[PDB]
Amino acid sequence: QPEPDMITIFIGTWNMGNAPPPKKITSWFLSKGQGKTRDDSADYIPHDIYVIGTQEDPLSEKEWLEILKHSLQEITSVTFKTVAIHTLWNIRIVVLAKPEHENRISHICTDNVKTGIANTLGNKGAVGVSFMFNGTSLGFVNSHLTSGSEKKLRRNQNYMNILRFLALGDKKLSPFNITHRFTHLFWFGDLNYRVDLPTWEAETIIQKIKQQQYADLLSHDQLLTERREQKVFLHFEEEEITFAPTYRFERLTRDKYAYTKQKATGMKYNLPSWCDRVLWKSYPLVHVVCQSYGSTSDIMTSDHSPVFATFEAGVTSQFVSKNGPGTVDSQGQIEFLRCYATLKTKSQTKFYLEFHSSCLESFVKSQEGENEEGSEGELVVKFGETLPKLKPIISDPEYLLDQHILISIKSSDSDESYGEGCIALRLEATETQLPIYTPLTHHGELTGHFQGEIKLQTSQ
Numbered sequence: 176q177p178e179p180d181m182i183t184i185f186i187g188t189w190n191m192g193n194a195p196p197p198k199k200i201t202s203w204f205l206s207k208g209q210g211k212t213r214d215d216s217a218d219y220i221p222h223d224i225y226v227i228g229t230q231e232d233p234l235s236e237k238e239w240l241e242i243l244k245h246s247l248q249e250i251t252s253v254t255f256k257t258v259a260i261h262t263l264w265n266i267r268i269v270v271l272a273k274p275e276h277e278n279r280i281s282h283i284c285t286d287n288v289k290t291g292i293a294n295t296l297g298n299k300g301a302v303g304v305s306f307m308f309n310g311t312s313l314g315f316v317n318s319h320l321t322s323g324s325e326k327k328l329r330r331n332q333n334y335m336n337i338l339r340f341l342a343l344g345d346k347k348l349s350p351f352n353i354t355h356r357f358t359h360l361f362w363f364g365d366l367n368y369r370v371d372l373p374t375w376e377a378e379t380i381i382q383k384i385k386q387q388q389y390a391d392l393l394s395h396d397q398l399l400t401e402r403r404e405q406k407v408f409l410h411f412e413e414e415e416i417t418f419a420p421t422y423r424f425e426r427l428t429r430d431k432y433a434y435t436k437q438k439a440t441g442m443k444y445n446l447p448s449w450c451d452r453v454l455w456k457s458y459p460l461v462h463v464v465c466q467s468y469g470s471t472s473d474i475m476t477s478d479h480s481p482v483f484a485t486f487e488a489g490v491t492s493q494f495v496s497k498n499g500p501g502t503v504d505s506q507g508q509i510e511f512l513r514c515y516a517t518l519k520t521k522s523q524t525k526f527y528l529e530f531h532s533s534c535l536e537s538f539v540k541s542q543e544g545e546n547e548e549g550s551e552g553e554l555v556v557k558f559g560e561t562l563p564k565l566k567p568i569i570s571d572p573e574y575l576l577d578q579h580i581l582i583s584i585k586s587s588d589s590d591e592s593y594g595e596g597c598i599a600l601r602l603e604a605t606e607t608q609l610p611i612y613t614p615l616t617h618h619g620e621l622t623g624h625f626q627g628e629i630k631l632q633t634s635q
């Protein structure tokens with residue numbers, strides 16, 4: 176039975192509005208409704224992994240697991256296995272997988288982050304799950320961010336707190352936050368970004384939605400505008416939105432948006448908005464293709480509609496050679512030439528690099544670089560030809576060309592990372608000097624760049 180080189184992943188996000196679901200929710204898992212929908216000819220084909228994020232979920236874990244498993248069994252005639260379930264207040268994540276994957280999945284982690292302080296601590300935050308699927312690390316975050324049209328900055332702050340403090344994946348990757356720990360990271364939820372248009376324009380917005388004319392609305396979507404200004408979700412991707420706003424509906428129909436201010440809304444307007452979103456970030460040159468992104472039309476218990484997204488995702492096998500794991504393979508090496516970091520810091524300490532990768536027996540620390548001044552004010556840290564030669568555990572190019580090197584640039588004075596990035600070993604050539612590049616981030620914000628050349632030797 177061969178190991179897969181691709182899997183499909185279903186991501187669902189639904190703010191349930193504190194109401195039990197209706198008796199049938201299969202359209203959600205079938206990617207049917209509005210937007211980029213899944214072909215009817217695929218309806219009986221199970222996804223490999225289903226990741227369900229809820230917000231304002233009134234159900235017990237047991238109650239929701241029984242609904243989800245029975246739903247998928249009706250669709251697919253497969254009894255899915257529960258990989259993980261984690262709940263913070265009314266924010267929940269469930270991961271289900273086909274039974275054949277049970278002995279491909281390991282290192283299952285769960286965590287949560289509570290956002291805000293005092294007042295603003297008590298119902299918003301995130302839950303997450305990570306695990307290994309054979310050689311590939313997968314992370315999943317379901318977040319319920321701060322509500323309200325005039326709180327986009329709070330939402331951006333909630334995002335940074337979640338990516339700093341959510342403790343998922345390999346703890347040995349100590350300089351790296353969740354935005355670097357996974358081959359594939361999916362971040363979804365009721366992110367609560369709004370369409371930023373004047374209140375007086377509510378009926379005009381509704382008109383546009385009825386005409387399926389979303390362009391003048393998406394140009395005011397706060398998540399797209401904040402992302403384009405690099406204020407949030409730097410280096411994540413989202414599929415084009417081709418479904419109507421998923422909030423705020425009158426319950427028990429989808430014929431009406433309920434936008435007007437009420438005591439129950441704190442006298443706030445809720446103009447129609449794309450509150451409910453799926454984003455991803457995968458390591459460079461790994462296969463990931465969004466195959467659906469849309470909303471259901473027939474699940475009407477909540478003031479939100481469920482959102483679905485599905486992905487093809489490249490995976491790798493758990494590789495064994497006669498040498499590594501458990502030793503190095505002398506026929507492999509990774510060399511860095513002419514490398515330098517460009518940092519935005521105003522500080523003057525010496526810096527060194529750390530190289531982390533599951534192709535190495537353990538992480539590698541470089542010598543200190545030589546600091547110079549860039550022509551436009553910047554700090555440039557030069558490593559020249561001084562970086563250590565990296566010794567992979569396995570030299571076979573079918574393994575090594577699928578790997579990645581995480582890089583942290585650390586202060587010699589404090590051993591704190593000033594920037595993190597990732598280099599793919601999926602090169603155009605071996606035994607050939609080739610340019611490499613990564614942006615560097617810290618707490619998910621841009622802090623600099625790392626560039627130079629690589630030379631990769633494999634057994635071929």
Ligand SMILES: c1ccc(SCCN2CCOCC2)cc1
Nearest residue numbers: 399400402403404409410411412
């Ligand atoms: C919002 C809207 C448009 C863009 S254009 C750049 C798109 N990507 C994103 C991440 O991958 C590289 C570039 C970005 C944010």
